Structure formats: C-alpha cells, structure tokens
Amino acid sequence: LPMRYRKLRVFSGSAVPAPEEESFEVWLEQATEIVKEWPVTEAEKKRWLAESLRGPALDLMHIVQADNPSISVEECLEAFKQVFGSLESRRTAQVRYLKTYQEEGEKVSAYVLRLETLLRRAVEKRAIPRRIADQVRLEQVMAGATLNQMLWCRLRELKDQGPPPSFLELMKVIREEEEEEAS
Amino acid sequence: LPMRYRKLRVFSGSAVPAPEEESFEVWLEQATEIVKEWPVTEAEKKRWLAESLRGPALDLMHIVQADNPSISVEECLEAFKQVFGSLESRRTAQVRYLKTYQEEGEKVSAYVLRLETLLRRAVEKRAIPRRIADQVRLEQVMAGATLNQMLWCRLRELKDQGPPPSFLELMKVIREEEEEEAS
Prior knowledge:
This is part of a larger assembly, with two copies of chain A. Chain A is built from nine helices and no strands. In chain A, helix 3 crosses helix 4. Chain A is an all-alpha fold. Chain A is 58% helix and 0% strand. The interface between A and B is small, with 9 and 9 residues. Chains A, B: One of its GO terms (biological process) is positive regulation of apoptotic process. Chains A, B: Its main location: nucleus. Chains A, B: This is Paraneoplastic antigen Ma2. Chains A, B: It is found in: Nucleus, Nucleolus.
C-alpha cells in the first residue's frame, strides 16, 4: 500500500531562506500542479495554495486579491511570478557558466554534475546554440577540472575519437577512473 | 612629387620583440605583397624577403630551402606560417573578449577603439555570430566602462531607440560627452 502522505514543498521569498525551502522554480511546479490538475473547489485550491507560502511571499497574496475581486488562480500566479521570479541577461547566463571551476576537495564526478545544471540555463536563454552543447561541455571540463594524468589520457581520446560524448557516457568514463585500491 | 621611399616593416619572431617591430599578421601583409604583386626576378624577391627578417625568424629560412631545392616563394611562406603564426581555440577568443575592462586614466573613446579589435577576431573564429555583433558591442561597453551619469542617460536611449548603433555612430555620441569647459 502507498505510504504516508507527503508534505508540501515551501517558499519564503526572503533574501536568505531557511535550508528546508525550495527554489522558486520548484515551488512553482507544485503550484502549477495544484492549479491545473487537482479535482478541487476554488476556495479549497486557494487554501492549499496559501498554506504553502511563508516569509514575505505570504504577504503579497492578500494585497493582489483586494484590488481585483474577479481574479482567478491562473491570473493570481501571473502577479506572483513578476515579484518573486527571475530576470537574467543573455550575457550573464554565458559569463556565469564559463567562470565555473572545481572546488577544494570536490570530486570530478561531483563537479561534472554541478556544471550540467548551468549548461541547460545557458541553452534555454539562447546564449549557447543547442547544436554545439556536447562540444562546449568537454572543452569546459578540460578547462576547469584538476584531472590526474591517466584520466587525461582517456579524455584526450574522447576529444579525437569521432563525435563528442553525451552526459551519461562522459560520466561513466570519469567514474571508472575515480576508484582507489586499499592498503 | 612622391616623397622619400618607405622603409620595410620588420619582424624578429622573438618572445619579446623590439618596440619597432610589427605583429606577424602585418609583416605577412608586406610579404604577401612582395610575393603576389612586385614585378621582380625570383632571387631579387628572395633577397627583399630575406632583408626584412631578424631574430630567430631569419634563421629558419635557410634550413627549409636546403632540404628542398624546388621550393617556390609561395611554398616557403607556408612553412613560415606554421612555425611563427597563431593558434587559438574558439573558447579562448570568446573568453579573451568578454574579460576586457577600462584601465586607470584611460578615456572612454580610447577604450571603445581598443575593444573593437577584439570583437573582429571573435567573429572571424565563429565564436560570436555576425548577426548580433552590434548588440554584443553595446552590452560590453555598459558592462566595462566607467560612464558618467550624463553619458549614462544617452547610452540608455540608444539601447531602446530602435536598432543598436554602428561603430562610428557610438563613437560620435561618446566624443560629444568627453569634452570639458575651462576655468
């Protein structure tokens, strides 16, 4: 049998959130689900929507409704996106990707996962053409990582051995090299 | 009457040249002229070509000829390009442009000229699409320059007033703002 009901994800909109809160992009997934999918009455949608909000973000929702009583939940979410959503230039998406380097004590397979989230944003905002993202991924790994020289021998084969690797192919080759023998 | 004959441009190939020498890209203009245009005999071409070389660069020319006596001047310049020419990735052209900021005591019209040489290299090497170079120029000037706020008011009109400006249009608007009144 399906286990315990799952708690709502949550969001404050604060300049420094609590470590249990989500990104706006993820709270907006839960909110889009509640709006589009749930078989529920409007005031019960609105009480489930309201129950997820904290911080400053809870405080906007009342102001917007009082000034327009005809507001649907589909319209109220459009006001919520303007105040708490995100604005970022093409140049900022591009510069924020290319500046990313491996940290102290971070593993190479941890770095290559962290770096892949930034490459998707830069391809959405048309900063990088989708035609060349697999070449741009390999060039940035060899630029930013602290590769051991047996790993260096393999990545230099992938650079030359036909087309550039996919994400899961590159991630496999890295994992085979990360393992150490005990003493 | 046309004035005194003009001295040959010159090139050493050294890791630090004398301040009178040119870039390889400019010595190669003079060499391409001598090869393609001058109405001269081969050994006299080769003595004019040789007379322009110094440093290490003078020393290669003999080695290459001894190993292949059939070598034309058109073929000998192809060997010269391999040893002294330039190699640069797409990613290095892009990163070397976007990192460029105004210096201590440099004027804004001096900065916008210095920055335009780097934008041409990045469009040759296909790092930046030629379709968008006029937008990319204005975004980098507002990022890198130390604009006074009356200049800031005008560049923010150009950003919104239809298409982005050309090089000489932007250079005119900057020059009108740089001038000061005496006391």
